[PDB]
Amino acid sequence: MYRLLNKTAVITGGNSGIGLATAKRFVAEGAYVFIVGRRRKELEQAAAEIGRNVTAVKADVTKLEDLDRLYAIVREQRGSIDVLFANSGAVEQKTLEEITPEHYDRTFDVNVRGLIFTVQKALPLLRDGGSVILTSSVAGVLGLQAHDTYSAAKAAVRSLARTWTTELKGRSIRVNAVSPGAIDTPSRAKAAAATPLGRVGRPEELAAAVLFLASDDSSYVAGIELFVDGGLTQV
Amino acid sequence: YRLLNKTAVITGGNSGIGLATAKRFVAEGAYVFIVGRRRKELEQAAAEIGRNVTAVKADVTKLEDLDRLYAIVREQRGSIDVLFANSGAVEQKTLEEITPEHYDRTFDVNVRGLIFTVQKALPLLRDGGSVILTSSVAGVLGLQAHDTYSAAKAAVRSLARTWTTELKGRSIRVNAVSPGAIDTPSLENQVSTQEEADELRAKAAAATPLGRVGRPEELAAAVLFLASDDSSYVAGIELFVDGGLTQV
Amino acid sequence: MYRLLNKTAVITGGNSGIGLATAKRFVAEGAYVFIVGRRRKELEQAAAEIGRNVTAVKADVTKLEDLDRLYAIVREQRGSIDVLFANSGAVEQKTLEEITPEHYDRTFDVNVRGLIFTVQKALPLLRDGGSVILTSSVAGVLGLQAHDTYSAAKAAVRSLARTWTTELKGRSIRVNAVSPGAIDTPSLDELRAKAAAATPLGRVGRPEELAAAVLFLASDDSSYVAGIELFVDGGLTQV
Amino acid sequence: MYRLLNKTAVITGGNSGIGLATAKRFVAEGAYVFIVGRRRKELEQAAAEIGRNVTAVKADVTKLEDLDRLYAIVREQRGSIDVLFANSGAVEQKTLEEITPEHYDRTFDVNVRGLIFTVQKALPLLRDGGSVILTSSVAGVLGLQAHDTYSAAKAAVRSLARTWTTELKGRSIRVNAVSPGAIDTPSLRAKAAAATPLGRVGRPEELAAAVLFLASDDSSYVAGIELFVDGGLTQV
Ligand SMILES: NC(=O)c1ccc[n+]([C@@H]2O[C@H](COP(=O)([O-])OP(=O)(O)OC[C@H]3O[C@@H](n4cnc5c(N)ncnc54)[C@H](OP(=O)(O)O)[C@@H]3O)[C@@H](O)[C@H]2O)c1
Ligand SMILES: NC(=O)c1ccc[n+]([C@@H]2O[C@H](COP(=O)([O-])OP(=O)(O)OC[C@H]3O[C@@H](n4cnc5c(N)ncnc54)[C@H](OP(=O)(O)O)[C@@H]3O)[C@@H](O)[C@H]2O)c1
Ligand SMILES: NC(=O)c1ccc[n+]([C@@H]2O[C@H](COP(=O)([O-])OP(=O)(O)OC[C@H]3O[C@@H](n4cnc5c(N)ncnc54)[C@H](OP(=O)(O)O)[C@@H]3O)[C@@H](O)[C@H]2O)c1
Ligand SMILES: CC[C@]1(C/C=C2/CCCc3cc(OC)ccc32)C(=O)CC[C@@H]1O
Ligand SMILES: CC[C@]1(C/C=C2\CCCc3cc(OC)ccc32)C(=O)CC[C@@H]1O
């Protein structure tokens, strides 16, 4: 506890899976968390599971006007952002032969386009010395059947952590990417066979790695790709 | 010669790296289709190449232009041995400056158009063919005001991995080339003055171990390696052609 | 606060710099620490700075018999090892033209040879589920003038984290490499503000900052992290 | 007449596998080649298979006095070096628990120590603008059971290509690493082919062709890289 004491965190995709596990860990570490998603019922249930120091905000990150509304609320309730975890994303499998323009747009709108504007519109509220975490994926460095657009989109996310390291260094804002392997979320058994640790990861394990990047334990860590995959991409 | 009687399609082939590659390919015995949007430059490029070339006007962001392109290739040559997906463009904008229109322009040409260029080439691509994607050193660097371009070129490199896996049954190799600073009309188009362009150039030469910008013919020669049988056991890679910039 | 509660840690090169800063953090998190080095007075002064739950062990990690002695002491006093931080290393600058066999041998003996046998001889004591941290360097992915053998040796260190991930997975032992950038340690003046200019964060790192990253890898917070290279360099190698 | 016309190339480990395959391709491209190895009969059969424009040199590259002899022969017969392919290496499998000091010393002496001094002593003869190719391995980026010392040594080899890029840039000498995957040579069943997208082991001639790219002027703007020649094994 106390490892994020009194810090204000915004987590997109915070109503399920990894974002929710991270929201819980952040609150346990003393932070106040805004969880962001499109479904209000799931946001309300997630916020109830978190139990304290949480505000749920309905927002589609692909809509600029929803991001403006999100940050107006953050400005009303807390006034600034210390930690931003841009975790909203979705995987849809299509082979190259199968790719449609709509499939391409759905993948890049949420994973890249919405991520760019999520971070852009947080800049006025981000405090100097803050920490931004981007969700990439092991897919960003692999050649996975039928993951064409998702893998390419997550590779784009990792690149943005590099560029934003350079652009935000004057404000001492650190930007790092986390690249999860197989995590037991709503997003089968071969992932456990291909991973040295021999199992899929738990969402709490990804939350703990994101906590490292959000916390002062990583104060000299900038621009990296932190693989949290039980060794999958490393051997 | 090293591409004797091979059929090559080069998008962005009317200038810079694509044109130098077209010239080298024809010099190695290939028949080349050069593809671009500008008719004056396509005709002059085809005239400079001089032989074994068909210029095709096509905007890779328009699906119907890609259909027409591959109808022309099917009629004139019947199949594709080498596909060099080289069309792309850089516009400098910082994170604060990014507009939806800037983002869309960058990813439409660098990623969307690249995906459908390769997708629509699949029926004509021969088993054992070679596909080369143009990424960039920007795809592994953190360059001021290159947010969308660098991210887009990282996406391009990822696709070489995915398509290696998906096309392995047809023995089609897919590889990415990542140029450093190459002396083309593109280095001068992203800046607003030629006092800036000479700064960007001698800065690139100073950060590169070989101490100079690359010549377009040098990138063409690396693309030739990936197109030729010399790379028959090379698949999914990122070939940096940058004078050592990203390697030290 | 107690993230290494009841854990036994062995830190080679714990006499000073990163190893010493890591030893302090480990003890603050509840571990019992063995610090290992060649100089006894400096070990005693370091252990006094640590203040509690520490045993200093004199050992030259390049000498197989000193490693045997080290682990015999660990076996009597604590019985097992939970965390191994192999931090012994040294930089000597020589250009390719300048390299002698002795310069080559000294660099790889401490950086690679001594590390291999430090880990080999810890295996009988390493508990299932333990964590091993190897010290690589940003030099392992760079082309730095006159760092020929040091950079190559640190690249070898990072490779071993991969191989040992595969070999030790049946025992659920995680092996990870930390790759420090410029850290303000006794490894020195004015080349420091040279490194600070090349780093996005605009500064050299503090040893406590590297210690915090090693703690992450040692702690259960990194329980799904295996085989990685964790760059702690203010962005130097990442942009 | 060709891509290496009248160029002088030195290939260590040139009496078998990739070394020999590369020597043959280099000669086919117009080069004069020195092949280097320890065994006289096999160097002698290697030179006979190449057939022309080749000098066999008996030398243990881990012995500094043999390297001096090697480069004296190169200077006398050809006068300078355009391409250096430092290809000597060997795999011995030992797990961490099994590693002995003798095993470690043998692995690093051939793969790293001998490689360093091979390149060091070639420096006086290397032409400005020359090309140096180092043999790394896919093992240098993988976690392969019982490959502890070999993988670490090949990782060291790839690192040296970066450092020497920086140190030799004033002479415009390019240094690049080639990292072979599974290549069908006497140094070695379906497991390698099953993990590789191209679905087969590589032919020695295929690695030779990749080394030729790095040796030839086609790679004149390529420096410090790791060229994977592995059918996609490490790339997907
Ligand atoms: N699980 C894995 O193995 C894995 C591996 C690599 C990367 N990731 C990435 O981790 C992140 C979270 O995924 P997950 O594993 O936790 O599965 P998940 O439970 O499905 O999480 C998806 C989250 O993103 C939200 N979301 C999706 N689209 C959104 C949109 N336009 N606007 C706002 N919110 C949106 C979702 O809430 P709403 O639908 O209500 O909006 C939800 O909270 C993603 O970026 C994912 O690609 C996961
Ligand atoms: N230092 C470098 O030069 C460098 C570095 C990294 C990557 N690259 C990449 O190398 C590739 C070649 O660019 P270049 O350096 O040689 O400059 P360039 O070719 O002179 O300019 C871009 C080329 O792509 C074509 N193009 C642009 N948009 C197109 C579209 N919708 N459809 C069809 N063609 C299009 C252009 O032809 P039209 O305008 O007539 O259509 C032109 O031929 C690019 O992808 C570039 O990003 C270059
Ligand atoms: N500082 C940086 O910027 C930086 C950057 C990259 C990597 N690193 C790595 O980080 C590690 C920690 O070094 P440091 O920077 O903190 O310097 P340091 O610890 O101040 O000096 C090296 C330490 O290793 C010990 N050591 C050296 N040879 C030994 C041997 N044969 N047996 C036992 N112990 C030995 C030394 O103690 P004794 O001499 O008393 O034995 C000393 O405590 C090193 O491996 C270094 O290569 C540091
Ligand atoms: C197209 C511009 C680009 C940029 C590279 C440099 C040269 C290397 C260092 C560098 C630092 C920068 O920060 C402001 C910006 C640019 C740069 C080129 O030269 C060609 C491709 C690459 O995209
Ligand atoms: C020697 C200290 C060390 C390497 C120094 C650098 C890294 C930064 C760039 C640099 C440029 C130089 O001039 C040619 C010389 C050295 C250097 C660091 O600090 C990081 C690891 C390693 O211990």
Rounded to a whole number, what is the distance in Å from the CA of B109 to chain A's nearest CA? 13
A15 burial via Cβ count (<10 Å: 0-12, 13-18, 19+): buried
Pairwise CA distance, residues B55 & A168, whole Å: 44
Q: What is the edge-to-edge ordering of all strands in the sheet holding C54-58?
A: C54-58, C32-37, C8-12, C81-86, C126-135, C174-180, C229-232
Side-chain half-sphere CA neighbours of B137 within 13 A:
22
- Give, for ligand 3, the residue of C25, C87, C229 to mutate: max count of ligand atoms closer than 8 Å to Cβ: C87
Rounded to a whole number, what is the distance in Å from the CA of B121 to chain D's nearest CA? 20
What one-letter code names the amino acid at D54? V
Question: Which atom of ligand 3 is found nearest the CA of C62?
Answer: 31
Distance B203 CA to ligand 4 centre (A): 8
Pairwise CA distance, residues D96 & C169, whole Å: 13
What one-letter code names the amino acid at B41? E
- What backbone torsions phi and psi does residue A183 show, to the nearest 5 degrees? -115, 135
Whether residues A219 and C209 touch (CB distance < 8 A) is answered with yes
Strand partners, A56: A35
Method: X-ray
Q: What is the edge-to-edge ordering of all strands in the sheet holding D174-180?
A: D54-58, D32-37, D8-12, D81-86, D126-135, D174-180, D226-229
Pairwise CA distance, residues A19 & A8, whole Å: 15
Nearest-5° angle of CA A22, CA A135, CA A156?
A: 170
Domain enclosing residue C239, as ranges: 1-239
Closest CA to C83 of C192, C214, C203: C214
Q: How many helices (H) and strands (E) does chain A have?
A: 8, 7
Pairwise CA distance, residues B142 & A200, whole Å: 32
Whether residues D149 and C116 touch (CB distance < 8 A) is answered with yes
Closest CA to C61 of C108, C104, C117: C117
Whether residues A142 and B161 touch (CB distance < 8 A) is answered with yes
Strand partners, A1: none
Rounded to a whole number, what is the distance in Å from the CA of C104 to chain D's nearest CA? 7
Whether residues B247 and C200 touch (CB distance < 8 A) is answered with no
Distance B86 CA to ligand 2 centre (A): 6
Strand A126-135 relative to strand A81-86, pairing = parallel
Pairwise CA distance, residues D116 & D128, whole Å: 19
Whether the CB of C112 is below 8 Å from some CB of chain D: the reply is: yes
Counting every residue, how long is chain B? 248
Task: Please list the alpha-helical segments (H only) found in B122-248.
Answer: 147-166, 194-207, 216-227
Closest CA to D208 of D33, D5, D1: D33
Nearest CA to ligand 4 atom 12: B143
Domain count, chain A: 1
Q: Are A7 and A34 in contact (CB under 8 A)?
A: no
Q: Are B3 and B10 in contact (CB under 8 A)?
A: no
Which element (helix H / strand E) includes A19? helix A17-28
Q: CA–CA distance from C181 to each of B49, B210, C11, D101 (Å)?
A: 50, 25, 20, 31
Q: CA–CA distance from B72 to each of B56, B58, B116, C57, D209 (Å)?
A: 8, 11, 17, 77, 33
C183 is in an annotated binding site: yes
Pairwise CA distance, residues A214 & A174, whole Å: 9
Query: Is the four-CA dihedral C97, C98, C103, C108 of positive or negative sign?
Result: negative
Q: Are A86 and A133 in contact (CB under 8 A)?
A: yes
What one-letter code names the amino acid at B185? P
Residue in the structure block whose two tokens are 């010395």 = A129
User: Out of A143, A144, A235, whose CB is closest to D142?
Assistant: A235
Closest Cα in chain D to A140 = D236
For residue A193, the domain's CATH number is 3.40.50.720
